[PDB]
């Protein structure tokens, strides 16, 4: 219900305009700072902040001597209303005599990142904000539907613009996006990625802020919406966001027993029908 802040200010540009500064920070979307801690800071003998003003999510501080080395001064804040969405806040620091000499810095929640996640590559900078998908092990668990678990997902409620069966070779990381290098065995459905075929490599990106993982060596089935970014080689790149069907294809080792062979039959019926027919219904 409470969170502790920390404000560090310093200057390495003493050659330019110098003097004092006004540190204007914006608290989180619902928090408001404690007046008691700032009053204790100001009423010190060797006071570091000479003036302050707190109102809602706005805190104003006046630093009369900006040093060259780090000098952090902290306080506390309480919570009034819940944070409706994950977002980074801002903190500006103006120069007293020339307010045009400012410095604005974005900061994030105690566990999130300071900038909105975005898939950026050359000209295209497709957004990657929302939810991240789950690893639905439908085959492993016991469930049954009348061409509804996968055919309905591919042709009734969501419309999947691409679908492949791929093999995971290598795992990597790139900024905040976890990267999976996969090879396409057979193409199930495509709209824009016409050049995709067998023995072709593709990249799958998932935000590194959740638990999704693709083990190496295993074979998966990927289906979802087509992206807008391109790889370094000029080939389309796909983002594993929500409303995307990812499912490991069984290797028949844990399917030969009678119970799961019916589910495997439903699987093969699905893949064959979807590959050969163009999303009926």
């Amino acid at each position: 219900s409470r969170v502790h802040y920390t404000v560090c200010i310093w200057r390495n540009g003493k050659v330019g305009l110098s003097g004092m500064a006004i540190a204007d920070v914006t608290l989180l979307s619902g928090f408001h700072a404690l007046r008691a801690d700032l009053e204790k800071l100001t009423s010190l003998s060797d006071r570091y902040v000479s003036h302050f003003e707190t109102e809602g999510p706005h805190v104003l501080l006046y630093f009369d001597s900006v040093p060259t080395s780090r000098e952090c001064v902290g306080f506390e804040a309480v919570q009034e209303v819940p944070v409706g969405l994950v977002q980074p806040a801002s903190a500006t620091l103006y120069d007293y005599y020339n307010p045009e000499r400012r410095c604005s810095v974005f900061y994030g929640a105690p566990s999130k990142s300071r900038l909105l996640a975005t898939l950026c590559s050359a000209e295209v900078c497709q957004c990657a904000e929302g939810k991240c998908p789950r690893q639905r092990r439908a085959l492993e668990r016991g469930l049954q539907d009348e061409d509804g678990y996968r055919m309905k997902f591919a042709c009734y409620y969501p419309r999947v613009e691409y679908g492949f069966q791929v093999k995971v070779l290598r795992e990597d990381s790139r900024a905040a996006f976890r990267l999976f290098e996969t090879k396409i065995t057979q193409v199930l459905h495509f709209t824009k990625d016409v050049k995709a075929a067998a023995n072709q490599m593709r990249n799958f990106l998932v935000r590194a802020s959740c638990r999704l993982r693709l083990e190496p060596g295993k074979e998966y089935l990927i289906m979802g919406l087509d992206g807008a970014t391109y790889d370094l080689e000029g080939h389309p790149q796909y983002l594993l966001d929500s409303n995307s069907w990812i499912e490991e294809m069984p290797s028949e080792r844990l399917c030969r027993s009678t119970r799961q062979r019916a589910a495997c039959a439903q699987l093969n019926d699905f893949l064959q029908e979807y590959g050969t027919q163009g999303c009926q219904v």
Partner: nanobody
Amino acid sequence: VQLVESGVQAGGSLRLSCVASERTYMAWFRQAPGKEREFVAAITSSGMMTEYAPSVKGRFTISRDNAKNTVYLQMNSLKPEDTAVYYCAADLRQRFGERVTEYDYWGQGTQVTVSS
């Protein structure tokens, strides 16, 4: 701005108290011979925030008194090999949870010994 601190077989309990003239976020540190001192826990000024070392998670607790302005630290379920000199230190700029040793006007501490 001066700090005064005052206050056993293994598996028992103890309650150290550190008193300071000024009311601030005085934290606790522990120093053992032959090795650099390491923190144990910290508390903010008002007292509604506490952090503890990973080795003592959910074991030691800190409270504060609003009348005499002192910090209390209870160590029920005392572990045999936690013997060290206990210090209470603080700074005047309210850097809550500042793990590294950047606390000014350090205290004198007390020697506490533990027997298995």
